[PDB]
Design a protein around this motif. Structure first.
Motif, short mmCIF file in Angstrom:
data_model
loop_
_atom_site.label_atom_id
_atom_site.label_comp_id
_atom_site.label_asym_id
_atom_site.label_seq_id
_atom_site.Cartn_x
_atom_site.Cartn_y
_atom_site.Cartn_z
N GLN A 68 0.81 -1.22 0.00
CA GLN A 68 0.00 0.00 0.00
C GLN A 68 0.84 1.26 0.00
N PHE A 69 2.14 1.10 0.25
CA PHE A 69 3.02 2.24 0.41
C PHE A 69 3.99 2.38 -0.76
N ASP A 70 4.24 3.62 -1.14
CA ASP A 70 5.23 3.92 -2.16
C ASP A 70 5.93 5.21 -1.74
N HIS A 71 7.10 5.06 -1.12
CA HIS A 71 7.84 6.18 -0.56
C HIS A 71 9.31 5.78 -0.48
N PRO A 72 10.23 6.72 -0.76
CA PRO A 72 11.65 6.32 -0.77
C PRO A 72 12.22 5.83 0.55
N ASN A 73 11.57 6.14 1.67
CA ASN A 73 12.03 5.69 2.98
C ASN A 73 11.14 4.61 3.59
N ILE A 74 10.36 3.93 2.75
CA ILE A 74 9.61 2.74 3.15
C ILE A 74 10.04 1.61 2.24
N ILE A 75 10.38 0.45 2.81
CA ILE A 75 10.85 -0.66 1.98
C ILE A 75 9.82 -0.98 0.90
N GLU A 96 21.77 -3.35 1.14
CA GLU A 96 23.09 -3.96 1.30
C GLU A 96 23.57 -4.02 2.74
N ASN A 97 23.27 -2.98 3.50
CA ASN A 97 23.83 -2.85 4.85
C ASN A 97 22.93 -3.35 5.97
N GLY A 98 21.80 -3.95 5.62
CA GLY A 98 21.03 -4.72 6.57
C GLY A 98 20.32 -3.90 7.63
N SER A 99 20.09 -4.51 8.79
CA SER A 99 19.40 -3.85 9.90
C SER A 99 20.26 -2.73 10.49
N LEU A 100 19.64 -1.60 10.79
CA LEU A 100 20.38 -0.41 11.21
C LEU A 100 21.10 -0.57 12.54
N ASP A 101 20.48 -1.22 13.51
CA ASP A 101 21.12 -1.35 14.82
C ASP A 101 22.42 -2.15 14.75
N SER A 102 22.39 -3.29 14.06
CA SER A 102 23.58 -4.12 13.94
C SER A 102 24.66 -3.43 13.10
N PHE A 103 24.24 -2.70 12.07
CA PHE A 103 25.17 -1.94 11.24
C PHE A 103 25.91 -0.90 12.08
N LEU A 104 25.17 -0.12 12.86
CA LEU A 104 25.83 0.91 13.68
C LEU A 104 26.74 0.32 14.75
N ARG A 105 26.36 -0.83 15.32
CA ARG A 105 27.22 -1.48 16.32
C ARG A 105 28.58 -1.87 15.74
N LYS A 106 28.62 -2.17 14.43
CA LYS A 106 29.86 -2.54 13.74
C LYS A 106 30.73 -1.32 13.47
N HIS A 107 30.14 -0.13 13.58
CA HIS A 107 30.82 1.12 13.21
C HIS A 107 30.75 2.18 14.30
N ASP A 108 30.91 1.74 15.54
CA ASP A 108 30.82 2.61 16.70
C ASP A 108 31.72 3.85 16.54
N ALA A 109 31.11 5.03 16.62
CA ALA A 109 31.79 6.33 16.55
C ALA A 109 32.45 6.67 15.20
N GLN A 110 32.08 5.96 14.13
CA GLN A 110 32.76 6.10 12.83
C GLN A 110 32.05 6.97 11.80
N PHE A 111 30.84 7.44 12.09
CA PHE A 111 30.13 8.33 11.17
C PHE A 111 30.12 9.75 11.71
N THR A 112 29.92 10.71 10.82
CA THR A 112 29.82 12.10 11.23
C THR A 112 28.42 12.34 11.75
N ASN A 161 20.72 0.98 3.16
CA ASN A 161 21.25 0.56 1.86
C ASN A 161 22.71 0.97 1.64
N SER A 162 23.24 0.68 0.45
CA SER A 162 24.65 0.95 0.18
C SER A 162 25.05 2.43 0.33
N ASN A 163 24.09 3.33 0.16
CA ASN A 163 24.33 4.77 0.25
C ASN A 163 23.85 5.37 1.57
N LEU A 164 23.61 4.49 2.55
CA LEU A 164 23.24 4.85 3.92
C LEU A 164 21.82 5.39 4.03
N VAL A 165 20.99 5.17 3.01
CA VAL A 165 19.59 5.59 3.08
C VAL A 165 18.84 4.56 3.92
#
Length: 282
Positions: free
Chosen positions: A80-87, A107-123, A159-163
């Motif tokens: 029912q949804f069509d929006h760039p920030n909805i799967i 590509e980058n999967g679930s957000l919580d696990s992704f961020l745990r792999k990159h602690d303090a590494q993003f701006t 995703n691959s571009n952090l969206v």
């Protein structure tokens, strides 16, 4: 407007999902077990002959009719949804078995696990971009009258571009006090959940309330205690969390307001330079 599939809810699948031809689907990588069967990824050939990556889920062999209905119910909602920030739902396969749901590859999967792999590494601006995307998806869901009830970083895909995109369209740490107290689920309880997601993101996927006893999570929040500012958290973002966590659901910001707040921070990144275990009484 969102329509709840719930008196022949199975017809909702065909109304909002494309029936895909399996000829056009290939499987490249098996991820493992899901709730109703296997989860994998692969490629989809579109009618225009374009080829895209996709996430694929199958219904287990020897499924019950209830399992089939619950499985496909995800598609009836997502479609029912069509929006760039909805799967995005690419479609379903229902005229052959195994039954499939085919969705946007992330590509980058679930957000919580992704961020745990990159602690303090993003701006901070990268993190704020992620959060703005999530808020934008939620603004659309709330515009449609869809209350998610399970908004949490584990249910956001990246995703691959952090969206970042909202998923999980098929207990306690993410739920507003009133929704816990008497099942009062509204877009304002989703805003509470969004506040928790904001904390998760700025904490690089720390678990909300850590492993506090659930009864204590309920009581502490009711007493006015809130999660503490994440390390190096901009004041503007911690304030936004507190605002999402207002006891009175009527005093919480609307998703449109949250998007505008984040957009202002993106436009004036110097605002983020003002910087603000244990819960804090608020």
């Amino acid at each position: 407007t969102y329509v709840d599939p719930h008196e022949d809810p199975t017809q909702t699948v065909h109304e909002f999902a494309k029936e895909l031809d399996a000829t056009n689907i290939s499987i490249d990588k098996v991820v493992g077990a899901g709730e109703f069967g296997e989860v994998c990824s692969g490629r989809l050939k579109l009618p225009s002959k374009k080829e895209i990556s996709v996430a694929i889920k199958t219904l287990k062999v020897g499924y019950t009719e209830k399992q089939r209905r619950d499985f496909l119910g995800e598609a009836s909602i997502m479609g029912q949804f069509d929006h760039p920030n909805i799967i995005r739902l690419e479609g379903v396969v229902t005229k052959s078995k195994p039954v499939m749901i085919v969705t946007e590859y992330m590509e980058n999967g679930s957000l919580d696990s992704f961020l745990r792999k990159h602690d303090a590494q993003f701006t901070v601006i990268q993190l704020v971009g992620m959060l703005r995307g999530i808020a934008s998806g939620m603004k659309y869901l709330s515009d449609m009258g869809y209350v998610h009830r399970d908004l949490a970083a584990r249910n956001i895909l990246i995703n691959s571009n952090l969206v970042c995109k909202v998923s999980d369209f098929g207990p306690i740490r993410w739920t507003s006090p009133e929704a816990i107290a008497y099942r009062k689920f509204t877009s304002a309880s989703d805003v509470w959940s969004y506040g928790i997601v904001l904390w998760e993101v700025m904490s690089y996927g720390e678990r909300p309330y850590w492993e506090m006893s659930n009864q204590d999570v309920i009581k502490a929040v009711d007493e006015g205690y809130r999660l503490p500012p994440p390390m190096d958290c901009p004041a503007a973002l911690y304030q936004l969390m507190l605002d999402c966590w207002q006891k009175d659901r009527n005093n919480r910001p609307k998703f449109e307001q949250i998007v505008s707040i984040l957009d202002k921070l993106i436009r004036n990144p110097g605002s983020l330079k003002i910087i603000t275990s244990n819960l804090l009484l608020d």
